[PDB]
Amino acid sequence: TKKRRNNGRAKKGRGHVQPIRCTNCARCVPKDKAIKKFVIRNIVEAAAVRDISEASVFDAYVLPKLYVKLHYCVSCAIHSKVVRNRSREARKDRTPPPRFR
Amino acid sequence: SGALDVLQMKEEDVLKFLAAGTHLGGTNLDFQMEQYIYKRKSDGIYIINLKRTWEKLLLAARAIVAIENPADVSVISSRNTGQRAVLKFAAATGATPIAGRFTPGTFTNQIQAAFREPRLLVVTDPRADHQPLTEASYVNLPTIALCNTDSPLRYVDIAIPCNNKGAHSVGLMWWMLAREVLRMRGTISREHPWEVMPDLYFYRDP
Amino acid sequence: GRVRTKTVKKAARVIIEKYYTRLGNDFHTNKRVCEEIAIIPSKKLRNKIAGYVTHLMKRIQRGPVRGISIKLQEEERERRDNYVPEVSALDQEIIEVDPDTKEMLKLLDFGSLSNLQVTQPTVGMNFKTPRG
Amino acid sequence: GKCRGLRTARKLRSHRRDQKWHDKQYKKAHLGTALKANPFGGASHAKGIVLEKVGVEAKQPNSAIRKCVRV
Amino acid sequence: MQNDAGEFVDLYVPRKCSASNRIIGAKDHASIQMNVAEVDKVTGRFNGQFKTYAICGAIRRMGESDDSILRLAKADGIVSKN
Amino acid sequence: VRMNVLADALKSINNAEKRGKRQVLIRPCSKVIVRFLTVMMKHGYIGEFEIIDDHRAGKIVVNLTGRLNKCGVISPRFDVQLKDLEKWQNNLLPSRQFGFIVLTTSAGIMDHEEARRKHTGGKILGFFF
Amino acid sequence: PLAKDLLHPSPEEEKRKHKKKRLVQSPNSYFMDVKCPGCYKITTVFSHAQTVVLCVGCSTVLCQPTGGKARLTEGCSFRRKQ
Amino acid sequence: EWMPVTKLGRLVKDMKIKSLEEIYLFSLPIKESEIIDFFLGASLKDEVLKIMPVQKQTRAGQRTRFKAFVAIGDYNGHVGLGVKCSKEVATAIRGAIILAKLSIVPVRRGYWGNKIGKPHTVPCKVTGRCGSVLVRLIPAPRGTGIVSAPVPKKLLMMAGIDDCYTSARGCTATLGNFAKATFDAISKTYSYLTPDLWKETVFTKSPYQEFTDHLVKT
RNA sequence: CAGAUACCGUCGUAGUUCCGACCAUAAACGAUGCCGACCGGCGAUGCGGCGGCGUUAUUCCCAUGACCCGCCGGGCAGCUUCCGGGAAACCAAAGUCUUUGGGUUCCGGGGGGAGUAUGGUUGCAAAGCUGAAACUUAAAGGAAUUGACGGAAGGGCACCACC
RNA sequence: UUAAAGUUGCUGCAGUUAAAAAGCUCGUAGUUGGAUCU
Ligand SMILES: [Zn+2]
């Protein structure tokens, strides 16, 4: 029987949505079915944030960042533990998790 | 107040209403409560009509007075802004208070320790203490509720349009209900004002 | 670990609630009065009631506790609740109304009220939270 | 929904007699292909001549040998 | 309810709702019968006599019990007009 | 599209006795609606109603009592001889004591109890109880 | 809800509704009376007017059409007909 | 010995309420079975309708309880229907007889054709439903009996209906749903507005209001 | 890898791309025919129209844009609810249904044999449309519950577990 | 063979998940058609 109300998708009122790959599995999942994720992290890992600054010939040199957008599939997102199975009543709550610390 | 000039709103009571702020509702409106509204100003706050408010107190005070046994009214608050205002309303009137936590089954489970059977329920905030409301609908209880603009009118019977968020505006509404119940009864009447100050009914923050 | 079961805590709560005048802070004189008040099957339970009582009497100086109710606090809360000020907080000579509130009072024929001091209304219609 | 006019009896009478054919109790008694397949031909009884006594085995959860006769 | 002889064949005659004329059932426990006192005309004290309203449980579950008791009091002349 | 204006104007007043309302609006009105509504009113089922005249096709506001259980239309308007009225008022009515079938005879839109007296058949329009 | 008054809607309740969903269909338009300042004539113009309305005398524009309401040009004042 | 724990029990035990129809008129709930024993009592009769074993799977087998469906009532009067489930069948039967006494409703009985004598049948056509079982009752002429299945026939005879036509759609083999649908149909006899119940209601005092001065002595 | 004629990795014809013909099928799905009326709320959103404080830009004015606060109409949706339905899951339609009738098309009749055989028709073919019976079975099945199981997760524990 | 069979359904069934709504749209016949005249 119908487990989701939007069929696990965001298609509401169009016929076809374009297919994109997966980043890991490379599986053609449609665009509103891919688990999406935007990462904003520093390009050098935070252990080497002191030693990049001592070797800086510039003063107060800013740290550039990585901006990639990740479209995981449905199968390999739950394998990679980026998304999980929830309860039948937690399934209806589509609010983002509390990342702000 | 059926066009009776003895029961009409006087000049001092409106000063009390405006000093406490009972006329200032929330930032939403239930569709049941659009009858009691005057208008929405800027910054969203609905202005509760006060000739409508004074007629719902005097309807509710007739309801409380028309009960013979004064200890059959059951007076309930769960938020702490109306927990002093209820023990002092029930002290001067004669009613039975449940201030604090209403454990469910108080009106249904006849085996329980805290079982009682009221003839009329007065609650303070139908959003908050809904559990005495839905439990009234098993045992045939009419219901007054001191209602805000965004507070839903299911199972209430005569809901007074007040501002039940501010601590002064709750205590003043309980004070007015106590005053009108005592005045419409046989006790000390409409000439001299009530010597019980309305600041007795307010909420004391540490 | 060392958690006290419902027997120790229930017995300690009733023996605080009934005999608060005799109990103090010393565990030893608490034990000497907990074996004269109550009939406890003996010592290894008697010293556990008297130890939670000695931990529970120190908890009463710092305020009320959410279980038991003793009549040295519940007279002080009673005299704290029957407290009226001298001049009430609703006796303000200058009370502030909006423009539109004065119109409602004029509908209720209270435009002749003298204490009302109408404020300047807010210039912007900005009250909703910034969604997104 | 069903048609519901007042001149719609030919749509009604002929939808039923096509829909009657999907009834297997109807079809097995009106098609004629299961009365030429019946060994009797629509008699209650019939007579024959015994060829041999073949005894055939019971089905799954219970065991015996049902004694039959080849007619 | 009556035969030809005029006698009454009923266990009881149930009360209908004051708002909507629906029969309040026997096991309809969400229903109300509410008494509202009448005041004296010149001093405003409790006269003794009251007005009675009955509200069926389906109306009260709808939330239309506030504006039914009110406009039944406005027709009996307890709430002042407007 | 709107086939049968009397059908939509009776399920408008059926759906509002459910929801507990005291007034319906039923646009548009024909004069078969006003004859049918006057038969329900004369048997105490409805109460007073007002015909709003815009120049197009009127609307009706009907004040409701709480007395109508069901209001219905028969489609198509089958022809009913008087010797076949008992089957109709046994299929459609809840008892032999109350409830009426409205049929349009050549003597006027009437009940089934009136059509029995004036000895008339007609076409069945609907029923109410 | 559940006791409105459909025979007598309030005059703000009438003006909120669609022009076909009112109790009687009232149009939402009018005929204005535009006065060009550079001339002295009077030319009756529909409010929700389509393609442009020229004066006969000065032969200039009065109102170019828009989506709903024809906007007057600058200096053209108007006084609404009755 | 009975010690009443409600206001209604203290009123009934002290003879202050003279019928069951006052408790029906003011629509009050009944929480003590000895009120029904006080009023109807020696004229009530019960029948167990079905004893149903139900089985919860555990890790150590199956745990078995037994539900009992008990119909009850007074012929010419009232009817109840109770379901209790327990580990013992006698305990289930006794709890089900208590539950069937507490769910006692009055049935309205009318006439088929002419109104001569006493009522015999249903007043109109009422229906009643419980999970894909419809039951419809139809009024019948004087003397046709209950024309129905055997399981609603016990309830209709215990009600005091003497004659009635019936029809049931749905999976009527599940006896609890078929019992709980004809009970629902004979509950709607007293919530159906026929034109003799169109007279405006004259209100009287509730039992809790009429005896509010005796109820503070206790 | 026991075995791989598969998963995995490296090459790689037809194809994947363009145009002229054919094919006419899909989990072609909202697994939900179209037209029409009545029936609860709430906040957003897209397009168009109307009214309104007050902020920006076109230097100031008008007009327009960008906002802000509403209202109306039609859209894709969402939350919510004892409207009512339903076997339930759930649906503001899957409601207005034994209190059964607004108009109208298609189409189902226990599970198999079987979308098979045959016949006709369409097509270069692949196939498409239309479409049985003999026999064979007492169940196949839908929702939901309680365990049990998981090479599904989160947590927790034990030297009859490990370190 | 008839009732049971509201399991052929005009009265009176069904079609999201149990058997089942044509991929979509246009369209002739059929079927059905808004107020209004004493
Ligand atoms: Zn993947």
Numbering used by the authors:
A (entry chain c): 2 to 102
B (entry chain B): 2 to 207
C (entry chain S): 2 to 133
D (entry chain X): 2 to 72
E (entry chain Z): 1 to 82
F (entry chain W): 2 to 130
G (entry chain b): 2 to 83
H (entry chain D): 59 to 276
Task: Show passages lifted from the paper.
Once inside host cells, not only does the virus hijack the cells' translational machinery to make viral proteins, but the virulence factor nonstructural protein 1 (Nsp1) also shuts down translation of host messenger RNA. In summary, Nsp1 from both SARS-CoV and SARS-CoV-2 binds 40S and 80S ribosomes and disrupts cap-dependent translation. All observed ribosomal complexes displayed the same binding mode of Nsp1 to the 40S subunit, in which the C-terminal domain of Nsp1 (Nsp1-C) is rigidly bound inside the mRNA entry channel. Our data establish that one of the major immune evasion factors of SARS-CoV-2, Nsp1, efficiently interferes with the cellular translation machinery, resulting in a shutdown of host protein production.
All of them displayed density for the Nsp1 C terminus in an identical position and conformation observed in the in vitro–assembled complex, and all complexes lacked density corresponding to mRNA. The second population comprises unusual, pre-40S-like complexes, in which the cytosolic ribosome biogenesis factor TSR1 is bound in two distinct conformations between the 40S head and body. These complexes do not resemble any known on-pathway biogenesis intermediates.
